[PDB]
mmCIF file of C-alpha atoms in Angstrom:
data_model
loop_
_atom_site.group_PDB
_atom_site.id
_atom_site.type_symbol
_atom_site.label_atom_id
_atom_site.label_comp_id
_atom_site.label_asym_id
_atom_site.label_seq_id
_atom_site.Cartn_x
_atom_site.Cartn_y
_atom_site.Cartn_z
ATOM 1 C CA UNK A 1 80.373 34.421 69.908
ATOM 2 C CA UNK A 2 78.568 32.774 71.328
ATOM 3 C CA UNK A 3 78.204 37.041 72.664
ATOM 4 C CA UNK A 4 81.089 38.414 70.472
ATOM 5 C CA UNK A 5 81.488 40.735 67.997
ATOM 6 C CA UNK A 6 77.916 42.346 68.469
ATOM 7 C CA UNK A 7 79.416 46.184 68.071
ATOM 8 C CA UNK A 8 82.112 45.448 64.899
ATOM 9 C CA UNK A 9 81.966 45.734 61.342
ATOM 10 C CA UNK A 10 84.539 44.597 58.978
ATOM 11 C CA UNK A 11 84.529 47.392 55.788
ATOM 12 C CA UNK A 12 86.323 46.441 52.839
ATOM 13 C CA UNK A 13 87.119 47.685 49.718
ATOM 14 C CA UNK A 14 88.110 51.158 51.084
ATOM 15 C CA UNK A 15 90.060 54.055 49.161
ATOM 16 C CA UNK A 16 93.329 54.185 48.935
ATOM 17 C CA UNK A 17 94.828 56.560 51.539
ATOM 18 C CA UNK A 18 92.214 57.514 53.621
ATOM 19 C CA UNK A 19 92.118 57.710 57.266
ATOM 20 C CA UNK A 20 90.645 56.363 60.307
ATOM 21 C CA UNK A 21 89.223 59.980 61.301
ATOM 22 C CA UNK A 22 87.577 60.340 57.258
ATOM 23 C CA UNK A 23 86.033 57.093 57.376
ATOM 24 C CA UNK A 24 84.605 58.051 60.491
ATOM 25 C CA UNK A 25 83.041 60.892 59.575
ATOM 26 C CA UNK A 26 81.276 58.846 56.388
ATOM 27 C CA UNK A 27 80.012 56.569 58.660
ATOM 28 C CA UNK A 28 78.983 58.826 61.272
ATOM 29 C CA UNK A 29 77.401 61.409 58.250
ATOM 30 C CA UNK A 30 75.555 58.663 56.396
ATOM 31 C CA UNK A 31 74.148 57.187 59.343
ATOM 32 C CA UNK A 32 72.184 60.594 60.189
ATOM 33 C CA UNK A 33 71.308 61.231 56.482
ATOM 34 C CA UNK A 34 69.649 58.029 56.511
ATOM 35 C CA UNK A 35 67.507 58.205 59.698
ATOM 36 C CA UNK A 36 69.685 54.778 61.386
ATOM 37 C CA UNK A 37 70.904 56.911 63.669
ATOM 38 C CA UNK A 38 68.935 55.754 67.410
ATOM 39 C CA UNK A 39 70.262 58.908 69.624
ATOM 40 C CA UNK A 40 71.560 62.057 69.813
ATOM 41 C CA UNK A 41 75.575 62.122 69.077
ATOM 42 C CA UNK A 42 77.877 59.891 66.733
ATOM 43 C CA UNK A 43 77.052 56.022 66.472
ATOM 44 C CA UNK A 44 80.713 55.033 65.519
ATOM 45 C CA UNK A 45 83.289 55.206 68.118
ATOM 46 C CA UNK A 46 86.385 54.179 66.440
ATOM 47 C CA UNK A 47 87.574 52.946 63.135
ATOM 48 C CA UNK A 48 90.882 51.032 62.855
ATOM 49 C CA UNK A 49 92.194 50.848 59.420
ATOM 50 C CA UNK A 50 95.228 47.758 57.437
ATOM 51 C CA UNK A 51 96.240 49.542 54.963
ATOM 52 C CA UNK A 52 98.047 46.995 53.896
ATOM 53 C CA UNK A 53 95.380 44.535 52.765
ATOM 54 C CA UNK A 54 92.996 47.802 52.270
ATOM 55 C CA UNK A 55 90.385 47.135 54.799
ATOM 56 C CA UNK A 56 89.022 48.454 58.309
ATOM 57 C CA UNK A 57 86.892 47.248 61.296
ATOM 58 C CA UNK A 58 84.308 50.014 62.952
ATOM 59 C CA UNK A 59 83.104 50.046 66.195
ATOM 60 C CA UNK A 60 79.777 50.787 67.154
ATOM 61 C CA UNK A 61 78.294 51.977 70.827
ATOM 62 C CA UNK A 62 75.382 50.133 70.891
ATOM 63 C CA UNK A 63 73.764 46.836 68.918
ATOM 64 C CA UNK A 64 70.644 47.760 66.699
ATOM 65 C CA UNK A 65 73.204 50.548 65.114
ATOM 66 C CA UNK A 66 75.778 48.004 63.931
ATOM 67 C CA UNK A 67 72.906 45.769 62.539
ATOM 68 C CA UNK A 68 71.350 48.692 61.024
ATOM 69 C CA UNK A 69 74.269 49.863 59.351
ATOM 70 C CA UNK A 70 74.778 46.774 57.605
ATOM 71 C CA UNK A 71 72.390 48.203 55.128
ATOM 72 C CA UNK A 72 74.994 50.309 53.552
ATOM 73 C CA UNK A 73 76.390 47.525 52.116
ATOM 74 C CA UNK A 74 77.454 48.506 48.488
ATOM 75 C CA UNK A 75 77.265 52.515 49.179
ATOM 76 C CA UNK A 76 80.184 54.139 47.084
ATOM 77 C CA UNK A 77 82.952 55.972 48.890
ATOM 78 C CA UNK A 78 85.480 58.090 46.624
ATOM 79 C CA UNK A 79 84.866 56.065 43.386
ATOM 80 C CA UNK A 80 84.870 52.843 45.545
ATOM 81 C CA UNK A 81 81.469 50.611 46.820
ATOM 82 C CA UNK A 82 82.464 48.907 50.114
ATOM 83 C CA UNK A 83 81.847 46.020 51.075
ATOM 84 C CA UNK A 84 79.748 45.771 54.625
ATOM 85 C CA UNK A 85 80.254 42.335 56.613
ATOM 86 C CA UNK A 86 80.344 40.647 60.123
ATOM 87 C CA UNK A 87 83.021 39.744 61.828
ATOM 88 C CA UNK A 88 83.594 36.417 61.572
ATOM 89 C CA UNK A 89 83.461 35.744 64.879
ATOM 90 C CA UNK A 90 80.373 36.689 64.462
ATOM 91 C CA UNK A 91 77.756 34.117 64.818
ATOM 92 C CA UNK A 92 73.696 34.347 65.433
ATOM 93 C CA UNK A 93 72.088 32.533 68.399
ATOM 94 C CA UNK A 94 70.891 29.087 67.580
ATOM 95 C CA UNK A 95 67.455 28.263 65.400
ATOM 96 C CA UNK A 96 67.722 31.487 64.730
ATOM 97 C CA UNK A 97 67.402 30.940 60.924
ATOM 98 C CA UNK A 98 66.355 26.985 61.147
ATOM 99 C CA UNK A 99 64.295 26.434 58.010
ATOM 100 C CA UNK A 100 60.888 23.798 57.189
ATOM 101 C CA UNK A 101 61.313 22.023 53.796
ATOM 102 C CA UNK A 102 58.304 20.289 52.794
ATOM 103 C CA UNK A 103 56.986 18.790 49.327
ATOM 104 C CA UNK A 104 59.545 15.939 49.071
ATOM 105 C CA UNK A 105 58.796 12.602 47.097
ATOM 106 C CA UNK A 106 58.982 10.369 50.416
ATOM 107 C CA UNK A 107 61.257 7.610 48.347
ATOM 108 C CA UNK A 108 64.675 9.725 48.668
ATOM 109 C CA UNK A 109 67.350 9.196 51.448
ATOM 110 C CA UNK A 110 69.017 11.835 53.575
ATOM 111 C CA UNK A 111 72.212 12.218 51.115
ATOM 112 C CA UNK A 112 69.975 12.605 48.090
ATOM 113 C CA UNK A 113 67.654 16.168 49.611
ATOM 114 C CA UNK A 114 71.163 17.298 51.743
ATOM 115 C CA UNK A 115 71.807 17.241 47.468
ATOM 116 C CA UNK A 116 69.707 20.302 46.797
ATOM 117 C CA UNK A 117 70.373 22.254 49.949
ATOM 118 C CA UNK A 118 73.531 22.195 49.167
ATOM 119 C CA UNK A 119 73.878 23.517 46.380
ATOM 120 C CA UNK A 120 73.159 26.795 47.395
ATOM 121 C CA UNK A 121 75.947 26.381 50.081
ATOM 122 C CA UNK A 122 77.148 24.146 53.568
ATOM 123 C CA UNK A 123 75.077 23.117 56.262
ATOM 124 C CA UNK A 124 75.502 23.695 59.830
ATOM 125 C CA UNK A 125 72.225 21.084 60.987
ATOM 126 C CA UNK A 126 70.157 18.973 59.327
ATOM 127 C CA UNK A 127 67.331 16.529 59.581
ATOM 128 C CA UNK A 128 64.894 14.383 57.688
ATOM 129 C CA UNK A 129 62.183 13.047 59.188
ATOM 130 C CA UNK A 130 61.228 9.744 58.925
ATOM 131 C CA UNK A 131 59.209 6.735 60.766
ATOM 132 C CA UNK A 132 61.622 5.460 63.124
ATOM 133 C CA UNK A 133 59.697 2.345 63.513
ATOM 134 C CA UNK A 134 59.754 1.358 59.837
ATOM 135 C CA UNK A 135 62.496 4.064 58.573
ATOM 136 C CA UNK A 136 60.751 5.670 55.787
ATOM 137 C CA UNK A 137 60.526 9.154 54.933
ATOM 138 C CA UNK A 138 57.525 11.703 56.060
ATOM 139 C CA UNK A 139 58.164 13.886 53.399
ATOM 140 C CA UNK A 140 59.404 17.083 54.940
ATOM 141 C CA UNK A 141 63.209 18.617 56.863
ATOM 142 C CA UNK A 142 64.974 21.182 58.190
ATOM 143 C CA UNK A 143 67.736 22.717 58.272
ATOM 144 C CA UNK A 144 70.367 25.262 59.094
ATOM 145 C CA UNK A 145 72.650 27.076 56.770
ATOM 146 C CA UNK A 146 76.146 27.717 57.731
ATOM 147 C CA UNK A 147 76.034 31.343 55.838
ATOM 148 C CA UNK A 148 73.005 33.236 57.003
ATOM 149 C CA UNK A 149 72.681 35.619 54.195
ATOM 150 C CA UNK A 150 72.008 31.988 51.904
ATOM 151 C CA UNK A 151 68.621 31.411 53.850
ATOM 152 C CA UNK A 152 66.989 34.141 51.947
ATOM 153 C CA UNK A 153 68.696 32.461 48.417
ATOM 154 C CA UNK A 154 67.480 28.694 49.387
ATOM 155 C CA UNK A 155 63.997 29.958 50.090
ATOM 156 C CA UNK A 156 63.592 32.411 46.344
ATOM 157 C CA UNK A 157 64.972 29.699 44.513
ATOM 158 C CA UNK A 158 62.985 27.009 46.377
ATOM 159 C CA UNK A 159 59.704 28.289 47.633
ATOM 160 C CA UNK A 160 56.795 27.309 45.029
ATOM 161 C CA UNK A 161 58.895 25.603 43.129
ATOM 162 C CA UNK A 162 57.925 22.534 40.952
ATOM 163 C CA UNK A 163 59.881 18.640 41.826
ATOM 164 C CA UNK A 164 58.212 15.812 40.782
ATOM 165 C CA UNK A 165 54.688 16.374 40.614
ATOM 166 C CA UNK A 166 54.691 18.151 43.776
ATOM 167 C CA UNK A 167 55.624 21.587 44.755
ATOM 168 C CA UNK A 168 58.129 22.507 47.612
ATOM 169 C CA UNK A 169 57.505 24.885 50.642
ATOM 170 C CA UNK A 170 60.996 26.627 52.116
ATOM 171 C CA UNK A 171 60.003 28.547 54.756
ATOM 172 C CA UNK A 172 61.792 29.722 58.081
ATOM 173 C CA UNK A 173 60.739 27.253 60.663
ATOM 174 C CA UNK A 174 59.380 29.595 63.613
ATOM 175 C CA UNK B 1 104.938 54.445 46.768
ATOM 176 C CA UNK B 2 101.842 55.670 44.987
ATOM 177 C CA UNK B 3 100.822 58.127 46.915
ATOM 178 C CA UNK B 4 105.237 59.258 46.941
ATOM 179 C CA UNK B 5 104.902 61.175 44.169
ATOM 180 C CA UNK B 6 101.381 63.124 45.428
ATOM 181 C CA UNK B 7 103.625 64.970 47.453
ATOM 182 C CA UNK B 8 106.207 66.581 44.978
ATOM 183 C CA UNK B 9 106.579 69.144 43.019
ATOM 184 C CA UNK B 10 108.525 70.043 39.276
ATOM 185 C CA UNK B 11 109.862 73.805 39.511
ATOM 186 C CA UNK B 12 110.927 75.052 36.744
ATOM 187 C CA UNK B 13 112.583 78.939 35.495
ATOM 188 C CA UNK B 14 114.992 78.805 38.547
ATOM 189 C CA UNK B 15 117.591 81.697 39.065
ATOM 190 C CA UNK B 16 121.131 80.711 38.714
ATOM 191 C CA UNK B 17 123.576 80.300 41.612
ATOM 192 C CA UNK B 18 120.762 79.082 43.578
ATOM 193 C CA UNK B 19 120.987 77.177 46.906
ATOM 194 C CA UNK B 20 118.388 74.069 48.266
ATOM 195 C CA UNK B 21 118.171 75.625 51.416
ATOM 196 C CA UNK B 22 117.138 78.939 50.095
ATOM 197 C CA UNK B 23 114.405 77.221 47.850
ATOM 198 C CA UNK B 24 112.892 75.601 50.676
ATOM 199 C CA UNK B 25 113.495 78.999 53.193
ATOM 200 C CA UNK B 26 111.283 80.608 50.360
ATOM 201 C CA UNK B 27 108.237 77.689 49.626
ATOM 202 C CA UNK B 28 107.800 77.675 53.401
ATOM 203 C CA UNK B 29 107.496 81.810 53.812
ATOM 204 C CA UNK B 30 105.344 81.862 51.214
ATOM 205 C CA UNK B 31 103.048 78.625 52.806
ATOM 206 C CA UNK B 32 102.410 80.706 56.304
ATOM 207 C CA UNK B 33 102.163 83.898 54.026
ATOM 208 C CA UNK B 34 99.491 82.740 52.225
ATOM 209 C CA UNK B 35 97.801 80.768 55.340
ATOM 210 C CA UNK B 36 98.181 77.308 52.698
ATOM 211 C CA UNK B 37 99.002 75.246 56.178
ATOM 212 C CA UNK B 38 97.447 72.480 58.010
ATOM 213 C CA UNK B 39 99.383 72.482 61.363
ATOM 214 C CA UNK B 40 102.380 74.174 62.788
ATOM 215 C CA UNK B 41 105.862 74.407 61.076
ATOM 216 C CA UNK B 42 107.288 73.586 57.787
ATOM 217 C CA UNK B 43 105.502 71.419 54.717
ATOM 218 C CA UNK B 44 108.450 71.173 52.664
ATOM 219 C CA UNK B 45 110.894 68.698 54.032
ATOM 220 C CA UNK B 46 113.446 68.463 51.273
ATOM 221 C CA UNK B 47 114.125 70.071 47.512
ATOM 222 C CA UNK B 48 116.539 68.895 44.812
ATOM 223 C CA UNK B 49 117.978 70.809 42.600
ATOM 224 C CA UNK B 50 119.819 70.621 38.684
ATOM 225 C CA UNK B 51 121.239 73.185 38.116
ATOM 226 C CA UNK B 52 123.058 72.688 34.646
ATOM 227 C CA UNK B 53 119.020 72.279 33.247
ATOM 228 C CA UNK B 54 117.274 74.868 35.846
ATOM 229 C CA UNK B 55 115.045 72.887 37.494
ATOM 230 C CA UNK B 56 114.510 71.518 40.752
ATOM 231 C CA UNK B 57 111.958 69.088 42.901
ATOM 232 C CA UNK B 58 110.767 70.123 46.556
ATOM 233 C CA UNK B 59 108.749 67.300 48.695
ATOM 234 C CA UNK B 60 106.457 68.025 51.223
ATOM 235 C CA UNK B 61 104.863 66.096 54.133
ATOM 236 C CA UNK B 62 101.290 66.202 53.270
ATOM 237 C CA UNK B 63 98.787 65.285 50.110
ATOM 238 C CA UNK B 64 96.831 68.142 50.486
ATOM 239 C CA UNK B 65 99.848 70.645 51.264
ATOM 240 C CA UNK B 66 101.059 70.062 47.455
ATOM 241 C CA UNK B 67 98.178 70.436 46.260
ATOM 242 C CA UNK B 68 98.081 73.978 47.794
ATOM 243 C CA UNK B 69 101.345 75.186 46.957
ATOM 244 C CA UNK B 70 100.373 74.867 42.923
ATOM 245 C CA UNK B 71 98.861 78.098 43.414
ATOM 246 C CA UNK B 72 102.643 79.517 43.694
ATOM 247 C CA UNK B 73 102.353 78.931 39.769
ATOM 248 C CA UNK B 74 104.387 82.212 38.421
ATOM 249 C CA UNK B 75 105.529 83.167 41.743
ATOM 250 C CA UNK B 76 108.285 85.475 41.813
ATOM 251 C CA UNK B 77 111.684 84.599 42.848
ATOM 252 C CA UNK B 78 114.443 86.363 42.489
ATOM 253 C CA UNK B 79 113.306 88.993 39.961
ATOM 254 C CA UNK B 80 112.246 85.797 38.038
ATOM 255 C CA UNK B 81 108.867 83.602 37.634
ATOM 256 C CA UNK B 82 108.716 80.302 38.340
ATOM 257 C CA UNK B 83 107.293 77.550 36.733
ATOM 258 C CA UNK B 84 105.219 74.766 39.084
ATOM 259 C CA UNK B 85 104.073 71.628 37.744
ATOM 260 C CA UNK B 86 102.864 68.076 38.462
ATOM 261 C CA UNK B 87 105.183 64.899 38.765
ATOM 262 C CA UNK B 88 105.140 63.349 34.837
ATOM 263 C CA UNK B 89 104.336 60.507 37.113
ATOM 264 C CA UNK B 90 101.536 61.993 38.830
ATOM 265 C CA UNK B 91 98.515 60.187 39.777
ATOM 266 C CA UNK B 92 95.302 61.842 40.185
ATOM 267 C CA UNK B 93 93.133 58.725 41.211
ATOM 268 C CA UNK B 94 95.124 56.881 43.299
ATOM 269 C CA UNK B 95 95.415 52.970 43.390
ATOM 270 C CA UNK B 96 94.123 52.816 39.532
ATOM 271 C CA UNK B 97 96.998 50.694 38.694
ATOM 272 C CA UNK B 98 96.437 47.800 41.487
ATOM 273 C CA UNK B 99 96.125 44.567 39.921
ATOM 274 C CA UNK B 100 94.453 41.363 41.692
ATOM 275 C CA UNK B 101 96.585 38.115 40.950
ATOM 276 C CA UNK B 102 93.807 35.102 41.288
ATOM 277 C CA UNK B 103 93.857 31.657 40.164
ATOM 278 C CA UNK B 104 97.201 30.859 42.231
ATOM 279 C CA UNK B 105 98.474 27.482 43.539
ATOM 280 C CA UNK B 106 97.623 27.366 47.307
ATOM 281 C CA UNK B 107 101.369 26.148 48.027
ATOM 282 C CA UNK B 108 103.188 29.017 46.648
ATOM 283 C CA UNK B 109 104.487 31.499 49.229
ATOM 284 C CA UNK B 110 105.068 35.449 48.526
ATOM 285 C CA UNK B 111 108.917 35.180 47.031
ATOM 286 C CA UNK B 112 107.747 32.493 44.528
ATOM 287 C CA UNK B 113 104.601 34.941 43.383
ATOM 288 C CA UNK B 114 106.949 37.939 43.563
ATOM 289 C CA UNK B 115 109.205 35.856 40.921
ATOM 290 C CA UNK B 116 106.474 35.289 38.123
ATOM 291 C CA UNK B 117 105.382 39.058 38.391
ATOM 292 C CA UNK B 118 109.132 41.181 39.051
ATOM 293 C CA UNK B 119 109.787 39.157 35.484
ATOM 294 C CA UNK B 120 108.334 42.635 34.229
ATOM 295 C CA UNK B 121 109.804 44.419 36.577
ATOM 296 C CA UNK B 122 109.812 45.687 39.716
ATOM 297 C CA UNK B 123 107.547 46.421 42.270
ATOM 298 C CA UNK B 124 106.026 49.033 45.078
ATOM 299 C CA UNK B 125 103.608 46.930 46.513
ATOM 300 C CA UNK B 126 102.865 43.390 47.313
ATOM 301 C CA UNK B 127 100.458 41.217 49.557
ATOM 302 C CA UNK B 128 99.913 37.262 49.161
ATOM 303 C CA UNK B 129 96.384 36.662 51.115
ATOM 304 C CA UNK B 130 96.466 34.208 53.865
ATOM 305 C CA UNK B 131 94.409 32.750 56.692
ATOM 306 C CA UNK B 132 95.643 33.987 59.775
ATOM 307 C CA UNK B 133 94.730 30.678 61.940
ATOM 308 C CA UNK B 134 96.805 28.553 59.381
ATOM 309 C CA UNK B 135 98.869 30.809 57.908
ATOM 310 C CA UNK B 136 97.799 29.211 54.633
ATOM 311 C CA UNK B 137 97.331 31.043 51.530
ATOM 312 C CA UNK B 138 94.013 31.334 49.884
ATOM 313 C CA UNK B 139 95.364 31.900 46.241
ATOM 314 C CA UNK B 140 95.113 35.628 45.623
ATOM 315 C CA UNK B 141 97.388 38.539 45.856
ATOM 316 C CA UNK B 142 98.018 42.109 45.045
ATOM 317 C CA UNK B 143 100.800 44.283 43.785
ATOM 318 C CA UNK B 144 102.018 47.441 41.803
ATOM 319 C CA UNK B 145 104.560 47.967 40.113
ATOM 320 C CA UNK B 146 106.903 50.873 40.162
ATOM 321 C CA UNK B 147 106.781 52.055 36.536
ATOM 322 C CA UNK B 148 102.886 51.962 35.923
ATOM 323 C CA UNK B 149 103.271 51.650 32.149
ATOM 324 C CA UNK B 150 104.645 48.128 32.799
ATOM 325 C CA UNK B 151 100.941 47.443 34.112
ATOM 326 C CA UNK B 152 99.637 46.255 30.817
ATOM 327 C CA UNK B 153 102.189 44.495 29.673
ATOM 328 C CA UNK B 154 102.284 42.285 33.091
ATOM 329 C CA UNK B 155 98.625 41.321 32.577
ATOM 330 C CA UNK B 156 98.654 41.082 29.029
ATOM 331 C CA UNK B 157 101.662 38.421 29.684
ATOM 332 C CA UNK B 158 100.019 36.630 32.663
ATOM 333 C CA UNK B 159 96.167 36.922 32.509
ATOM 334 C CA UNK B 160 94.995 33.271 30.973
ATOM 335 C CA UNK B 161 98.243 31.925 32.065
ATOM 336 C CA UNK B 162 97.791 28.009 32.802
ATOM 337 C CA UNK B 163 99.793 28.064 35.594
ATOM 338 C CA UNK B 164 99.930 23.838 36.532
ATOM 339 C CA UNK B 165 96.794 23.172 37.375
ATOM 340 C CA UNK B 166 95.176 26.017 37.729
ATOM 341 C CA UNK B 167 94.578 29.535 35.050
ATOM 342 C CA UNK B 168 95.486 32.617 36.426
ATOM 343 C CA UNK B 169 93.356 35.920 36.594
ATOM 344 C CA UNK B 170 94.939 38.813 36.289
ATOM 345 C CA UNK B 171 93.236 42.165 36.205
ATOM 346 C CA UNK B 172 93.311 45.783 38.136
ATOM 347 C CA UNK B 173 91.638 45.051 41.664
ATOM 348 C CA UNK B 174 89.795 48.116 40.597
#
């Protein structure tokens, strides 16, 4: 990015020998049947297939329809479950999926707290709030995952859960 | 490779002395008469004749027109009723015998990985997946054998094989 790749999606596991036209027709028909289209006409403008590596890139007419179409992840097309993803180049804007982690033992250092979070996936940002004059923990931290799909996995696996004699709070910071 | 047999048909009970060009003219004429063509021009691209055993193969320009010509089973040519069938190696579900190969050492290149595979027989398709930014192997590959009946002999031979430091996964890609 920062503003790049907003109107394309990766589609993996496409059926063998399928055409660009046929894939286009399929996605345009689903957008309509599922009520995800936001104006009259076709949301998908073009499809590019790599037949050797069995994947496609769809290009959409709008930003919001690209986002809506991700709800089709897993849809079966000619026997095949399609893998729908953002382009590698796509990044959300900074602080969009920042997490607050509260209810931590205050005797734990930074690497020890990071350990629990990186079990779900890699981090692109982390800070453990400390009393700068003494250096000691305040019992809470902030972080952001490299993969934004992991955010809800960390919340689901850590929020409301027992850690020592204290219960964690894990939620979006804003 | 796989769809190659999706564009041909076996023809039996052919009349004595018939040429490849004569067979070609008859089938093109029949397809145009029935309106079974998808475009202008001639659907049959080539015919091969075995005159000793009285059969031919026809090759078509498309998968859909091949399926259509199947409706000519029993049609009369030079007083004789022709038998039209699929090749014995026709794949009705295409891509069914495509294999995934996982757990490869990441230093191995395309030719080294094929060498492991071609001990069981000739391949029709192969690709090793690489990171496009560095050109470095991601450690998995895909393939298909020319003879699909070798597929399960390769899975039996290769699946779970300790390959240096790693253990191979070899299965149908799905």
